[PDB]
Nucleic acid binder design. Structure first.
Ligand SMILES: [Cl-]
Ligand SMILES: [Cl-]
Ligand SMILES: [Cl-]
Ligand SMILES: [Cl-]
Ligand code: NI
Ligand code: NI
Ligand code: NI
Ligand code: NI
Ligand code: NI
Ligand code: NI
Ligand code: NI
Ligand code: NI
Ligand code: NI
Ligand code: NI
Ligand code: NI
Ligand code: NI
Ligand code: NI
Ligand code: NI
Ligand code: NI
Ligand code: NI
Ligand code: NI
Ligand code: NI
Ligand code: NI
Ligand code: NI
Ligand code: NI
Ligand code: NI
Ligand code: NI
Ligand code: NI
Ligand code: NI
Ligand code: NI
Ligand code: NI
Ligand code: NI
Ligand code: NI
Ligand code: NI
Ligand code: NI
Ligand code: NI
Ligand code: NI
Ligand code: NI
Ligand code: NI
Ligand code: NI
Ligand code: NI
Ligand code: NI
Ligand code: NI
Ligand code: NI
Ligand code: NI
Ligand code: NI
Ligand code: NI
Ligand code: NI
Ligand code: NI
Ligand code: NI
Ligand code: NI
Lengths: 105, 99, 87, 100, 99, 79, 106, 99
DNA sequence: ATCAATATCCACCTGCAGATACTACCAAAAGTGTATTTGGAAACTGCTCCATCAAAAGGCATGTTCAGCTGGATTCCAGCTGAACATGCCTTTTGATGGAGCAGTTTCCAAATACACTTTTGGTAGTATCTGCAGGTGGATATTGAT
DNA sequence: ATCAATATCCACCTGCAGATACTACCAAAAGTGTATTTGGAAACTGCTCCATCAAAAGGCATGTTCAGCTGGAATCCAGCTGAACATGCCTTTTGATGGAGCAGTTTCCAAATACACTTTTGGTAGTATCTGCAGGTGGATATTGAT
């Protein structure tokens, strides 16, 4: 009986318990910590896949590509900030032209 | 009667085009030689995994595009639409890349 | 047989068209003539800094090959984290 | 078959794929995007583990518990993401602690 | 029969004065109130070590002083000598605080 | 008031220390908005360090560490 | 104890302490004997540099006691310390005198 | 009086000693000494932190003098890097070659 | 230019906050010596992947020039908007005094680590096999610039 | 306003690069159970240093007047865009080759851990000596703005 299934999680609680030890973050690692972390990690993955999935859909594609992660992240105020110092390879940028540069009159 | 788009119309069209796409905008080999040259002045007889060079390019293009957004913003603050070395310099000063 | 050529002036490989394309992605409509040489300068400094940290990691590993990970660690320590290439 | 046995290179990709099927059953993912995804997960893990690390130190503690992870999440994620992550995490710990 | 200095002369004099010293420039109690007021929305009935407020003032004023430096560069770039909300605004965007 | 306790002459002094010569009237309200956003961000985090420590008092360390992770390291309070 | 590792290394900084601090910091499973010596010396050097330029700063301003003002002047006047301390605020240090040239009279 | 004695350690006495070797005629205030303490803790944290990463990147379980060295290279600017590497090698040498 | 009004500078002064100096008591920090363990350097070597040349087009996208449009640079100028200014009063500060709560102590157990079979699984390896979509084309709708 | 000359769209095609699904075997990872140890909650304690308000101190809100900075308007021209034309020795791309060096496996020793026992010392806690300089002044002189 896995600890993931035991916590109701798709993400690997055993692996996360392990990486927390190998990483030298403290002398000891409580059994709840990996449970919470695997959950948080799965929550965030779900949030971005949700939105990336929509960008793929909005673009008549059925396979998510890095462009889709980028529209997803950059369109979402909170993911954008969490990932404010992060570059997504092959993500491009958001279509955006400053008003003054448009023709009129 | 020979047809000419006015100045700024092909430029705007280009913004749309490149903002739409994600492909690298500097050519591969020229980029690669530059890397090999700069690296060689630090240390001789280096080799690069191809994905090291691809990582350097992806990183350099994202950095340059963003610097242009910041630069564009600095021109517009000066009520221009033409980017100028002083616009880039002001961007880099405020970003702390300079002072 | 052993090749190796001299590498010099490659920063001019960053052509005017390629700098024009990048500024477009950056939403830039008009570009003064002096921008090209300035951009080359700024790129060169960017690379010097990334490559230098990258090569440091390469040497510390006692390698002669610069890996994607070295670059990725170098970007990471200068606050320009790259996703798409590992670790 | 079998070349001197390459060392295991482990990633979160099977997990990420499961979660994708859950939210978008008919959607696929390129290996580049999967690569981005695996990076993002390692990235957030290191960041949370590191706030947690420091947190423990600051309070003369030598154990990282779910409580350190929680403060870490609150320090790290903005507004609505922190709230829901804390809720999903607490949910899981409770769920876990009530088995046996 | 009055003595008036030209506009800017007292300004310049003040700059020279305030750049030469290090005393805090906001008054201690209003700052303290604001700190407590803002904190109250995160947690009720809070107390503050006096050095904890001091720290916040030092960090706050350092931050604003540097923001005025950048703001000033932004005005000057627009050929002005008067700082304006758009200047602060452009500083913060390029700094990545609004972006 | 409270936010208005940060007075126009105070804001003007800070600007002068930052080398500012002339000042548009709208700057004052803008400066306060900016300050409030700065403190919110720093205090939120410091107060999270307090809550964790099970304290009812914000310590200098709580602030100093909040400033560290906001990327605004302050020296002179780490005793 | 015969001689402190500091004096073996020729250092005024506490090698023992640094070694202990590297262990309790969970930086790695094991810590080699060399490292705290290397590290202590780097720390001494950087301290000496700062104190050296701040001493100078105290002199210029006709004084014999270093205050935060003098560390600010020392650090901000030095291209290198200034970068190293690019994101640091020295409390009670103020700023370098600087007035943009276009703001000057007439 | 071993009650209220939760020992808080600081680099003060060592900072003080080094002050004498460089300016024997000169002293240092509380606040300044506190600044210096923060400075040393900070550089320790940054260097130790970078060594830790190095060790992990190369699947090592030990921080040797080689790790501190690369760390200093990566962290310190040009000239400061050069001299600190200098001091650092000098002290390890001296220490090896001490009875 | 003349020149009064003020700011700024400089030596000199005292008093006191905060520096230093010297002693005493002590947990814990630091080394010393000595059996025990283990990470990582060393030598060998399989197998990945980097350099490099070839030769075509899959020939694209570049460099060069040249016209002439218009944004940027300049000059001028009217009014709007910040700076300067002066001091009573009203808010800050600097003092005084309980008491909240941080920080110290010590008791104790729920949960951590250690260690041993025993089981399960994710990585990988390698063919075997669909499928989304890049790039093509055409042919119908959208825009720009000249009248 | 017509419209002609392009660019732009987007829905229906293709051929394959790349995604998903076989089953293989297995080192490692993960679970389950058992004994042995321990960090930290939790309960109480005191003395530190925090919120409160004494009155003593002194900065600032107010408004009116006016210099000068700002944005608006007008003119001019050169520096930029668009596009044509000629042609990379240019770059992409494909694919083959030899072998550099990275990475996996083994053997084995030097440097680290573990630990007990000894000796030192940095921090705390006073107690006393003393001094650097912040702030007050007097008097020369430099700056400013009105003539
Ligand atoms: Cl836990
Ligand atoms: Cl320019
Ligand atoms: Cl504005
Ligand atoms: Cl070592
Ligand atoms: Ni959202
Ligand atoms: Ni070279
Ligand atoms: Ni050339
Ligand atoms: Ni610490
Ligand atoms: Ni919600
Ligand atoms: Ni409120
Ligand atoms: Ni220097
Ligand atoms: Ni000296
Ligand atoms: Ni790692
Ligand atoms: Ni030197
Ligand atoms: Ni006179
Ligand atoms: Ni007069
Ligand atoms: Ni004089
Ligand atoms: Ni005193
Ligand atoms: Ni071994
Ligand atoms: Ni090993
Ligand atoms: Ni060829
Ligand atoms: Ni012409
Ligand atoms: Ni025009
Ligand atoms: Ni007028
Ligand atoms: Ni007004
Ligand atoms: Ni008065
Ligand atoms: Ni009392
Ligand atoms: Ni109490
Ligand atoms: Ni407590
Ligand atoms: Ni399986
Ligand atoms: Ni495979
Ligand atoms: Ni297509
Ligand atoms: Ni077509
Ligand atoms: Ni039209
Ligand atoms: Ni294939
Ligand atoms: Ni304990
Ligand atoms: Ni205990
Ligand atoms: Ni006028
Ligand atoms: Ni103007
Ligand atoms: Ni003109
Ligand atoms: Ni081969
Ligand atoms: Ni071969
Ligand atoms: Ni070889
Ligand atoms: Ni190797
Ligand atoms: Ni002692
Ligand atoms: Ni004392
Ligand atoms: Ni004296
Ligand atoms: Ni004296
Ligand atoms: Ni004085
Ligand atoms: Ni006088
Ligand atoms: Ni004059």
């Amino acid at each position: 009986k896995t600890r993931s299934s035991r916590a109701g999680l798709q993400f690997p609680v055993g692996r996360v318990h392990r990486l927390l030890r190998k990483g030298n973050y403290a002398e000891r690692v409580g059994a709840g910590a990996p449970v919470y972390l695997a959950a948080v990690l799965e929550y965030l993955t779900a949030e971005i896949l949700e939105l990336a999935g929509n960008a793929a859909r909005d673009n008549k594609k059925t396979r998510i590509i890095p462009r889709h992660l980028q529209l997803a992240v950059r369109n979402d105020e909170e993911l954008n900030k969490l990932l404010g110092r992060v570059t997504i390879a092959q993500g491009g940028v958001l279509p955006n032209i400053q008003s003054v540069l448009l023709p009129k009159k | 009667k020979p047809h000419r788009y006015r100045p700024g119309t092909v430029a705007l069209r280009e913004i749309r085009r490149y903002q739409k796409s994600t492909e690298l905008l500097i050519r591969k080999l020229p980029f690669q030689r530059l890397v090999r040259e700069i690296a060689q002045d630090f240390k001789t007889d280096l080799r690069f995994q191809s994905s090291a060079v691809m990582a350097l390019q992806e990183a350099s293009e994202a950095y340059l595009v963003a610097l242009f957004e910041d630069t564009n913003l600095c021109a517009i603050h000066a009520k221009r639409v033409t980017i100028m070395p002083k616009d880039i310099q002001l961007a880099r000063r405020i970003r702390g890349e300079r002072a | 047989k052993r090749h190796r050529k001299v590498l010099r002036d490659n920063i001019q490989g960053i052509t005017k068209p390629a700098i024009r394309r990048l500024a477009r992605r950056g939403g830039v409509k008009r570009i003064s003539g002096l921008i090209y040489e300035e951009t080359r300068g700024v790129l060169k400094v960017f690379l010097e800094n990334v490559i230098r940290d990258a090569v440091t990691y390469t040497e510390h590993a006692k390698r002669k090959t610069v890996t994607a990970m070295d670059v990725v660690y170098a970007l990471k320590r200068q606050g320009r984290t790259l996703y798409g290439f590992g670790g | 078959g079998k070349k001197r046995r390459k060392t295991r290179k482990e990633s979160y990709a099977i997990y990420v794929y499961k979660v994708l099927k859950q939210v978008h059953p008919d959607t696929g993912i390129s290996s580049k995007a999967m690569s981005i995804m695996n990076s993002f997960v390692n990235d957030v893990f290191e960041r949370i583990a590191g706030e947690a690390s420091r947190l423990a130190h600051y309070n003369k503690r030598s154990t990282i518990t779910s409580r350190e992870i929680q403060t870490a999440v609150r320090l790290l994620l903005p507004g609505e993401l922190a709230k829901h992550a804390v809720s999903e995490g607490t949910k899981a710990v409770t769920k876990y602690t009530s088995a046996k």
